[PDB]
Amino acid sequence: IETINKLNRISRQMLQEMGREPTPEELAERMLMPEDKIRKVLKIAKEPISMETPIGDDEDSHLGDFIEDTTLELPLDSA
Amino acid sequence: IETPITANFREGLNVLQYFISTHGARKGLADTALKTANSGYLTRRLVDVA
Amino acid sequence: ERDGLFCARIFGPVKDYECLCGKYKRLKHRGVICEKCGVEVTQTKVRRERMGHIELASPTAHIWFLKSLPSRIGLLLDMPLRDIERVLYFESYVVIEGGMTNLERQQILTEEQYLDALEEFGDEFDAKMGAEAIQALLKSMDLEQECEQLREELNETNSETKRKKLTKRIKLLEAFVQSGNKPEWMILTVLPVLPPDLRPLVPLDGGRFATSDLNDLYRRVINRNNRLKRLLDLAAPDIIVRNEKRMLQEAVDALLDNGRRGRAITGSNKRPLKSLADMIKGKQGRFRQNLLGKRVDYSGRSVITVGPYLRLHQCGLPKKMALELFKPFIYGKLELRGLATTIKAAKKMVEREEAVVWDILDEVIREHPVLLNRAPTLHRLGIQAFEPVLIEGKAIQLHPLVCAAYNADFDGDQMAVHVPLTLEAQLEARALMMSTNNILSPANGEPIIVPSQDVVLGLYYMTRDCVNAKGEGMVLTGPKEAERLYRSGLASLHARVKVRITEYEKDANGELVAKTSLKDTTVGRAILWMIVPKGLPYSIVNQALGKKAISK
Amino acid sequence: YSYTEKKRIRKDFGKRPQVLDVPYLLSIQLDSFQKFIEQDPEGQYGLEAAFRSVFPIQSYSGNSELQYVSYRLGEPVFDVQECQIRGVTYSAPLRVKLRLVIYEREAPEGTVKDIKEQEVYMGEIPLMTDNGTFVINGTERVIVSQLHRSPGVFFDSDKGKTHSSGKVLYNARIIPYRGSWLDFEFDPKDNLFVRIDRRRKLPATIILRALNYTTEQILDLFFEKVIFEIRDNKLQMELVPERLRGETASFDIEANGKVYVEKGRRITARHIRQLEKDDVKLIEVPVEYIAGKVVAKDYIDESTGELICAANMELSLDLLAKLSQSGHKRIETLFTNDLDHGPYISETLRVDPTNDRLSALVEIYRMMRPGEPPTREAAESLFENLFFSEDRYDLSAVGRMKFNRSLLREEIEGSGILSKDDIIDVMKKLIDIRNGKGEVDDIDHLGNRRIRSVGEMAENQFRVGLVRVERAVKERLSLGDLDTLMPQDMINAKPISAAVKEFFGSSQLSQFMDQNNPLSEITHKRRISALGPGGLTRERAGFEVRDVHPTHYGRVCPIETPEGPNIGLINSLSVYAQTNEYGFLETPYRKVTDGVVTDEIHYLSAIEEGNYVIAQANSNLDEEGHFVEDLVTCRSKGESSLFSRDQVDYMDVSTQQVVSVGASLIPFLEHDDANRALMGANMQRQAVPTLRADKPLVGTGMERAVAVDSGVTAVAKRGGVVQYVDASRIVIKVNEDEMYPGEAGIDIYNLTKYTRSNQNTCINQMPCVSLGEPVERGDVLADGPSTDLGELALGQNMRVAFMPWNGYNFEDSILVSERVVQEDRFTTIHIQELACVSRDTKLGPEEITADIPNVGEAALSKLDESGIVYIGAEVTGGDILVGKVTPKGETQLTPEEKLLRAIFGEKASDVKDSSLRVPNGVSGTVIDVQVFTRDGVEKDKRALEIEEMQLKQAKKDLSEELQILEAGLFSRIRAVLVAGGVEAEKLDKLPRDRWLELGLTDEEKQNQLEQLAEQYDELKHEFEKKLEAKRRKITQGDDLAPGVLKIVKVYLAVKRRIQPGDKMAGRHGNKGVISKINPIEDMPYDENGTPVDIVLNPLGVPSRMNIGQILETHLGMAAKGIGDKINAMLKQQQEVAKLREFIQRAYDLGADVRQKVDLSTFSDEEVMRLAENLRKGMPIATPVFDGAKEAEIKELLKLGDLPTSGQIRLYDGRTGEQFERPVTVGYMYMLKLNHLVDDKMHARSTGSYSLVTQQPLGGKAQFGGQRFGEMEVWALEAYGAAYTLQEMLTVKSDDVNGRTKMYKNIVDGNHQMEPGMPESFNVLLKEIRSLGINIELEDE
């Protein structure tokens, strides 16, 4: 959490000085850390999406049935 | 309405009569579109009863 | 985690017969508890039919037991809803049981009154806060004595409102006694946990995670329970303990019925979470979405087509519908004759669309039922069964005469196609829901075929008359002569021509009576009588054939 | 007359002259977008008003402040094409000038401590293109015209349906722009109740007492005072003679004379005027009349000192005796006797228990936030900040204007907050309306509702972002240092940009632009939606709101709105309507001065329309004079009547001012029903372009304006000589009159071919201008996807006959022929996107390898070394497109598979097969592939090919411009050398680049040559800089999603020819479907040359109360006859003068024509081109609500050598017999929606299922099962069937064991069911157990 906060505080100054989204290369050069750590932090730092989010503009069908069940096998392979 | 329409669809109509009949046509359309759901609710109730 | 929500030790393995650390391979090992992770090697469906529990520190009052009308808790305790609400939310104290003659059961005291009454007496004034007090009251109360008191009071007075109240209370008490339930079971000390499969946590295709609101609710409940335990283990002050208990009660409420007595808990972005009460009561709940009607295998939706191209009890279907639905039967009858090596090769042969595939599909579709549906299905005629025939063009054809049965005009609607698999269902669809067997409407004894079709208007025109123009002034022997005269291009179907009509009438026992005579009519009416079989009289067709006429 | 009109002339049957100017269709959009952004220091629009209302900001300490100076709009980073291809949000940076001024704590006004200034970046703002698209995340989203009520005060009445006795109650609501509304309602107990945000009902006097008002002041402001005098024996009053209206006299009125009014008779008007003429001053009234009234002020006691009787007290005998003994002989009593007034405030004071302002504030604080002890300071601060705050409570300048107009004020400008007198005036007006003086305001009136456009929505979002960022600044400034901290590190650009992105990507108004045809884009941008945040919802909408109000004349199109649940909620803005600076719709009219119609135009709103009279456009214009008929029909106050000449106030411009384009494009609108016209407008706006766009024969006169304002065609901003024409790039030389001396007079236009949208179709720009044809400003050099030459070609013109058949025209269907499919008519092009993404797993990185196991040469012959299909390959559904492999770890296998592997001995490496395949039933061709990777991953020798291809495609227009500029510079150098010396033969032989090395005499020519060389060097440097900038943009345009290595998009193009199963309709609304495709032989045919192509159904046509298609068919037959005559005259070379005379006689057939055809001034080549264009039939046009009568149709039929009846017999293509009655045949213009049977048809047997219920999914993209609702279940229950129901329910939805057993039995030939237990039932049981309920398998 502290590393994410430091990276965000650095990205805040980077965007204020440049005006564009902070590239991972410049962030890693300024942080003196490899790009793999920055990439992993940017990948993991994402809020999970809710399960009742509507797919469209109309609140008719939610995200209840929108994911396929790829865990169990199918009748084809069983047969 | 006190003043009715005198022409018909064969000789053509003006803007006034068309605009005065459109608000009744769409009124009936909205009425039947909203009652198509009350009818379904009534069918649901009648199926649940018997 | 080894102590998380969906831990592998409590709810079983995640994968198919595989431990947590991936050490217990060789599925043969069944029911062996590991020493490192401790995961019972079983199937994945074990998580579906098992649940957990949470050990709470302080008991909680069930929200939906007193918030639901007519507040059965208040009826059994003879106390209004406002009082039990003030007691549960730690606003005022209540006396459980008073041994002295000062106060008795069901007496409310505020913060100042409780302090004034506590400094005077001691060791006998029993009073707790909310859930504990209600549990002690339900444990110390006696049902038989209260029932006897109510039955003795009802015999003396007969005030309508009070009599009905006491009668409902006696009914509730008798039901509770005969049900074998205990009053201590009303409180909640250990609440169950939803199975992990009902609250899934799988990564989305967009590289992100999809969480569940119920997981967040359970996490909040567990966090509040841990905070309450840490406060009780460290001797927290009275105000902090009351606030933590109120928060735990609110969390239990939101987990059971999220936000109906007050403000709902704010969700992820803007919308509040839905609880089990919303999954049970709401219109998008499980009842009217997964029990009554839901998605069904071996189905399809297609566009309508305008053309008979068949007979009454037959409909036209595109090659693909059976291209995707009859493939199990295709593979079965391929293994029957042995034209394919295995099922895996038969699938590829079907995917190549060979000629033998269609030759076998022609026999698969030979005398096979299929259910047609139009949404919505109001009356019985909305669900019928037919038999399909392979055609070109990927739109399903519909029978012309079932347009009034399905109540679906040919304006570009969508039809649903379903396929029965079992011989039982196939036979009950062939016999019961056939267009030939089900021809009348369930509303009245009249035929449901009340048709459109200016085509039928032209039939009526055939049954009409016209001027005496060229073609009138002859006599014909039978309807076939009139048919030939009209097809050869000699006269119209309006000529007043006497036809030698041989009419048949039923006998008194069931036989037929033959009689031939001349009838003044036209050519079109003679053709219509020819279309009529030898089982109907001629006096009905002798007039104009409109809508009500053909209906009769 | 422009050249686009000279190519082909549309015969306009206009009866009334067109004197107005056709306004721009997408005008409100660009106007709002400019008003939100354009710099205006004196105008409070957009960012200016935002920074003026927010800044300067005051903190708690009040020592440091942040002031605003100005803002600067940035330059576009990437082009619109690059933003559409890559997917970057087209926007511009924002820099706001902010000054930090720190005061001193010692000095009172010492501001010399710290004064700094700096530009701060607050985020990006999405710009707008010429069309009006919002490029967000590579998608063209649009926000469109939210509808809501204007801020102010609205008085309404309750029309029953919720009462106890049935009394007409009233209410008044205050609608603010930001804050909480106030509702003053009338209780059925004759009491005025106040509600704040619909929380609790308070008396009406607590709000007045909270504003430091006593009882006597309220009684003086609301009620009137009457003076009663007493001299020891009497009760005299100063009775006004005009106040006795409706009062029963209970005594004898004697005022210095005889008995005036008898005891028992009521006061009449004659008695009123008599007593007024008598000059009555004092009347001795009895004691019974005075005893029972209400006092006004408090009369203190001069003897004791206490209050004998306070205000609002009923009079009695003892009270009057005490007042007489004390000495108060001037009693001020209120006047409440009849319906003229009402003692409702007295009852409110009696009910209200509060005494002073403190108790009122305490009660308000307890109502606002209960459960909290009330304190004086906090309650006062809350009451001052809720309503008396400028930054919190302020509606609008338009809001203040509406408030002043409702209160009948004189000034239309005021403060932003409410004063202590505004509420009093509102209450007075409300009680006057209750008494029966005012009128109940209507909600459907357009003067009470308004429209919020793109500018207002963006301003609200910017206000929210600025409030959040100023809260952040107040949080960060009260703790940080005032010296070492800079203003650039305090303000964070994340909240504002996040709010902007959320609004532009996930709001209800932000919808995907329907890019089927330009008409859809026009009718979507010119739409007005009442659904979304701020207005009513889909459920809240009832019947009283969706009805069309008579005030909607010429403002809102009533025949263009989607059906279903959104009927009468999302409408279409009319053509001539316009949004003024206040947000109200207005329509331009014409002044009528004593019957003389001048050219003066005045825009009127709904309130201004309801006051004057409007004459319809059907009045005859007497060659710029007065009216012809004495009694002209006009409309006013919602009623139509015959008025004289002097009673006419305004005149409409034309008849097409009410109906918008999307619904007025119908050739015959007055011959159709309202529902029929609505359905036709929907079918037309949802149409799909064809392969070869052909102009419609029958049309309107405003199609040119729509085609030129759609923005999809080539807009000629300057006009000139076209030099180079190509299928993708067109250059044009600007004339010397418009050529600027600074820049070059050559314009280049790149034709966008096959543009991708969210409604995938064939979007291209086909060029039309030839080599050597000049154009002017406002022309069309290249058409679009659904635009013909100067017209908007939606569908296709085909032959149509109204006749029955053997069942192919059963119920309003469409039967077509084979020539329609053979000639590629009604043929579209679909573009399906297919994206293959490469993501690394937790156990292995992701790689792309063409070598895929279990794949032969058949699938690898069309793949490159990297695994990408060659550009230009035709693929069929089932082939692999992108070769992607995934590393797999050690996977356990069953002993059977292990034995099989040991037998075969193959390697069988653990590599997953997750390659992209083509969906089944999709056989098309790939146009171009796109590979997008990040900066870390190398292009891997694959993207280099497409990069070099794009670079070769580029550097074309830039190179041509550079060569042209260099040639011009060399020509200038040659001219200078000729003017200086004789150089004619020593310049062409020498190279062009060696002209700067020649040294002439030391004079001015040497300096000119040096300046020209410096200019050439500057041009070369500019070209190099442009190339470097292009390369830098290409390099930096490598943005990729996190955790994604590569993305390969295919964009597979499919022909998808016409086949039975597609919905087709027209402009009147003859919706149907393609029944079958019969050959041209089995179709009916005419006598000589025209076989029938389309056969319609005459069953549902006469029942839907609309002639429509009949008149359209007759006019199309006339046009086709004229075209056949023109073609027959053109096939011969008799004489061009004869062709000119025939064209002139054909165009001059109309008796009363609007536009006179000028043909004598044209050349021979122009007439030849006109004839070649009209070979396909001349386009006949007609205005809206003004169509040619049947006489003109018969005359036009007789002109083209056709029968006047318009009904010709046909011959059957099957038997060859002649029909009894003739057939109505002719040309029509048919359209078709998307409605593709390839996409609508979707069936599945087995596949993917759900997670919680294991049930199939729903949708085409989902590829799942179909829904089986409760209606079919009830239908099966009504039947005797029991096995079908359970088979569909339990063993096909959730039970895995049952369905797999049934599958195993079917694949083995058993047909056994073996039912089990539904998994959904187990889920329900567990859900019930989760609540604490015991349900444990109750057995027998």
Curated annotation (Swiss-Prot), chain A:
Transmembrane segments: none annotated. Residues 2-78 are annotated as: Sigma-70 factor domain-3. It is found in: Cytoplasm. Interacts transiently with the RNA polymerase catalytic core formed by RpoA, RpoB, RpoC and RpoZ (2 alpha, 1 beta, 1 beta' and 1 omega subunit) to form the RNA polymerase holoenzyme that can initiate transcription. Identified in a complex containing RpoD, the RNA polymerase subunits RpoA, RpoB and RpoZ, CRP and DNA. Interacts with Rsd; this prevents interaction with the RNA polymerase catalytic core and with promoter DNA, and as a consequence, promotes transcription from promoters that require alternative sigma factors. Contains 4 domains, connected by flexible linkers. In the active conformation, the domains are in an extended conformation, each making extensive interactions with the RNA polymerase catalytic core. In the autoinhibited state, sigma-70 factor domain-1 packs closely together with sigma-70 factor domains-2 and -4, contrary to the extended conformation that is seen when the protein is part of the RNA polymerase holoenzyme. Belongs to the sigma-70 factor family. RpoD/SigA subfamily. Sigma factors are initiation factors that promote the attachment of RNA polymerase to specific initiation sites and are then released. This sigma factor is the primary sigma factor during exponential growth. Preferentially transcribes genes associated with fast growth, such as ribosomal operons, other protein-synthesis related genes, rRNA- and tRNA-encoding genes and prfB. This is RNA polymerase sigma factor RpoD. The lineage of its organism: Bacteria, Pseudomonadati, Pseudomonadota, Gammaproteobacteria, Enterobacterales. The chain holds residues 457 to 535 of 613 of the full protein.
Swiss-Prot record, chain B:
Acetylated on several lysine residues in the presence of glucose. Co-administration of salinamide and rifampicin or salinamide and myxopyronin suppresses the emergence of resistance to both antibiotics. Changing G28 to A/C: Resistant to antibiotics salinamide A and B. Changing R26C: Resistant to antibiotics salinamide A and B. Changing P4 to S/T: Resistant to antibiotics salinamide A and B. The RNAP catalytic core consists of 2 alpha, 1 beta, 1 beta' and 1 omega subunit. When a sigma factor is associated with the core the holoenzyme is formed, which can initiate transcription. The rRNA transcription and antitermination complex (rrnTAC) consists of RNAP, NusA, NusB, NusE (rpsJ), NusG, SubB, ribosomal protein S4, DNA and precursor rRNA; S4 is more flexible than other subunits. DNA-dependent RNA polymerase (RNAP) catalyzes the transcription of DNA into RNA using the four ribonucleoside triphosphates as substrates. Resistance to the antibiotics salinamide A, salinamide B, rifampicin, streptolydigin, CBR703, myxopyronin, and lipiarmycin can result from mutations in this protein. Belongs to the RNA polymerase beta' chain family. This is DNA-directed RNA polymerase subunit beta'. It comes from Escherichia coli (strain K12). The chain holds residues 755 to 804 of 1407 of the full protein.
Curated annotation (Swiss-Prot), chain D:
Changing A663E: Resistant to antibiotics salinamide A and B. It catalyses: RNA(n) + a ribonucleoside 5'-triphosphate = RNA(n+1) + diphosphate. Its EC number is 2.7.7.6. Keywords: Acetylation, Antibiotic resistance, DNA-directed RNA polymerase, Nucleotidyltransferase, Transcription, Transferase. InterPro entries: DNA-dir_RNA_pol_bsu_ext_1_sf, DNA-dir_RNA_pol_bsu_external_1, DNA-dir_RNA_pol_su2, DNA-dir_RNAP_su2_dom, DNA-dir_RNAP_su2_hyb_sf, RNA_pol_bsu_bac, RNA_pol_bsu_CS, RNA_pol_bsu_protrusion. SUPFAM superfamilies: beta and beta-prime subunits of DNA dependent RNA-polymerase. Changing L678M: Resistant to antibiotics salinamide A and B. One of its GO terms (cellular component) is membrane. Acetylated on several lysine residues in the presence of glucose. GO terms for biological process: bacterial-type flagellum assembly; bacterial-type flagellum-dependent cell motility; cell motility; cellular response to cell envelope stress; DNA-templated transcription initiation; intracellular iron ion homeostasis; nitrate assimilation; regulation of DNA-templated transcription elongation. DNA-dependent RNA polymerase (RNAP) catalyzes the transcription of DNA into RNA using the four ribonucleoside triphosphates as substrates. Resistance to the antibiotics salinamide A, salinamide B, rifampicin, streptolydigin, CBR703, myxopyronin, and lipiarmycin can result from mutations in this protein. This is DNA-directed RNA polymerase subunit beta. It comes from Escherichia coli (strain K12).
